[PDB]
Amino acid sequence: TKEMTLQRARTASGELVFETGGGLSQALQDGCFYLAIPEDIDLEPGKLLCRQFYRPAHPGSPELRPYRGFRRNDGIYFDREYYQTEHILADGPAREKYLPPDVVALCERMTSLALLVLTSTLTGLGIDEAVWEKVTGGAVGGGGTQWFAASHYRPERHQLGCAPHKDTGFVTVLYIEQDGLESSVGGEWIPIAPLPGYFLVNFGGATELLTARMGRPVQAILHRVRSCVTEPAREDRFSFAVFANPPATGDLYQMSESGEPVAVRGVEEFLRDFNNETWSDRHTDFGIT
Amino acid sequence: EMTLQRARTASGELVFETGGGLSQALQDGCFYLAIPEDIDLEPGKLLCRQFYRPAHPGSPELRPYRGFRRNDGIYFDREYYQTEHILADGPAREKYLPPDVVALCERMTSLALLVLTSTLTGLGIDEAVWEKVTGGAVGGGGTQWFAASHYRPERHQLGCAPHKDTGFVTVLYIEQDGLESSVGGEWIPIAPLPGYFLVNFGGATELLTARMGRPVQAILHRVRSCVTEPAREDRFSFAVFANPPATGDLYQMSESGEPVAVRGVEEFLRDFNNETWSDRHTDFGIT
Ligand SMILES: CC(C)C[C@@H]1NC(=O)[C@H]([C@@H](C)CCO)NC1=O
Ligand SMILES: CC(C)C[C@@H]1NC(=O)[C@H]([C@@H](C)CCO)NC1=O
Ligand SMILES: O=C(O)CCC(=O)C(=O)O
Ligand SMILES: O=C(O)CCC(=O)C(=O)O
Ligand SMILES: [Cl-]
Ligand SMILES: [Fe+2]
Ligand SMILES: [Fe+2]
């Protein structure tokens, strides 16, 4: 199966500019697109954490020490019983408390790109700016919950890489380097290829619910990581991503066809249903508290 | 465990024993239905204890209840889950299952249709549109599925993938603990109640009623990992489902009460399979 042919965008003076002809219209219909990584970003702190977080703090250099030992942190480390993936998931405060400052710096840059995509999309959908803070639970302006994930795919386990899921928030900005990610398009798993120098952007369940009654609804793509098999001298698969989410204590909104925001359900119960159908393991507070 | 409504049969009417009645059952998305006293459940329990066994060794009487792991059309060995199951529509049951089992399935399917018509009536949906929005399932058409599930305890996995049933109405037989439902975000066990089927609704009922005054939800459920052996036998279950045909469209009652086709059934089912099972049986419940 051939990979998806997605739109490609770049940021130019804080505006989203599309290099491919379909533009933001086609990208929203696809539910995902590639976003050029701003040339000044150093990705190496994120890759370093993805290569080290699951290793013991000792033995090893004192320089790598703040990048290791995270399997001990019950607050932000998640060993998945049924999948190859183990991952850090940390909100803003948790990143500043537990992750190296160069990683925190990288997350802040990725978060700004996620917010840029969010405001571009809301504008593209003709949603009144006056309701942006309310319908995003504050996420649009850097509030809400700004999640970070660092994933390591453990090849020694004969399991699927990542549970099939829809992301739960508004916008995801994802870094990948290896094959393995797939999306459900028309009922068939289509690979999403890594594009060097680009993030992958998609939308989450909160954007799907928000726009489900509009003229051009935006979908949250259903995606998984297939079982990862080691290729000699190729490193284990990893990924890292930031997500702009509504806070778990609030409500999810949906635009009525008359253009009015309606609070339709609580975020926390939505996330709990998500955890139950996606992971179904002991980490029942994952992404909530 | 949940405190569900209980109903029993009475001349082709659904009669509720408990005070919440049909209204509360539709709110819960599930309830217990008394098994008609004349029904023999043993053909179903027998198939559930035999279908995964080799044709031989064993008695010639049990042979038609065995050897289904070689039937590529109706047998599904799950990679990531303890469950292995038969899934057969009407014709396949006719063609591959013992008549005693086909007869029990017909009796369960009739109950599923009784529930479906009681639910469409209780929601005030016009009877003139029943055949259109159910793809013929309300009157015994569409696709009437049967599942026979065996939970392999030697597999150290979840018992059953968490899922919402895909159709309109499910009638399920269980005898052992293990089944759980997601209520208010928490996994709550659904206990086996002797002499009762479990009834719930599927994605098609949820989508159909999502924008009415009293939407009916399709309960999210799973089967925990089944602990290996000691004395008790392996867990099993069997059930029938009234589904829209894969070739049709899923409908939804509008704000004004008129049916609108919102998406195709097959693409709905393929998405379901991809997120629920995510294995090679990509035509499960479609072909
Ligand atoms: C694969 C995993 C690491 C991330 C995955 N994607 C999501 O968007 C959410 C995160 C943001 C938590 C909030 O729900 N949940 C998930 O499971
Ligand atoms: C657990 C399995 C045996 C049955 C389970 N429940 C459903 O309703 C459907 C069936 C009816 C097939 C059509 O989708 N799919 C499922 O996976
Ligand atoms: O690792 C991947 O490619 C997918 C990661 C992902 O889906 C997520 O973090 O939510
Ligand atoms: O085995 C059970 O208890 C549930 C089975 C089920 O959910 C199904 O067949 O759809
Ligand atoms: Cl239900
Ligand atoms: Fe994801
Ligand atoms: Fe089910």
Numbering used by the authors:
A (entry chain B): 3 to 291
B (entry chain D): 5 to 291
Give sentences from the paper.
Three αKGDs (BcmE/BcmC/BcmG) catalyze site- and stereo-selective hydroxylation of inert C−H bonds in BCM’s (bicyclomycin) cyclic dipeptide scaffold, one of the simplest peptide derivatives without additional functional groups. Our hypothesis posits distinct regulatory mechanisms: BcmE employs steric hindrance, BcmC relies on inherent reactivity, while BcmG utilizes a directing group to control C–H hydroxylation. Although these three enzymes share only 35–42% amino acid identities, the overall structures are similar, and r.m.s.d. values are 0.70 Å (SsBcmE vs SsBcmC), 1.07 Å (SsBcmE vs PaBcmG) and 0.87 Å (SsBcmC vs PaBcmG), respectively.
The DKP ring of substrate 2 is locked in the hydrophobic cavity formed by F245, F276 and F288. Two carbonyl groups of the DKP ring are involved in the formation of direct hydrogen bonds with the imino group of W281 and the water-mediated hydrogen bonds with the amide group of N277, respectively. We speculated that the crystal structure only captured one state of 2, and the single C-1’ − C-2’ bond of 2 is rotatable which could rotate to the state that C-2’ directs to the iron center, facilitating the hydroxylation reaction. This is in agreement with the results of DFT and MD calculations. However, the single-site mutations of F245A, F276A and F288A have almost no effect on the activity and selectivity, probably because the cavity of the SoBcmC is too large to affect the substrate binding and orientation (volume of SoBcmC is 252 Å3, but that of SsBcmE and PaBcmG are 139 Å3 and 210 Å3, respectively). The W149A mutation dramatically reduces the activity, owing to W149 may lock the substrate in the active pocket. In addition, mutagenesis of T170, N277 and W281, which constituted the hydrogen bond network with substrate 2, resulted in the reduction of C-2’ hydroxylation activity (19%–75% conversion yields) but performed the C-5 hydroxylation activity (4%–23% conversion yields) to generate product 2a, which is also the inherently more reactive site with the lowest activation free energy. Consequently, these findings suggest that the site selectivity of BcmC-catalyzed hydroxylation mainly depends on the innate selectivity of substrate 2, in which one C − H bond is inherently more reactive than the other bonds.
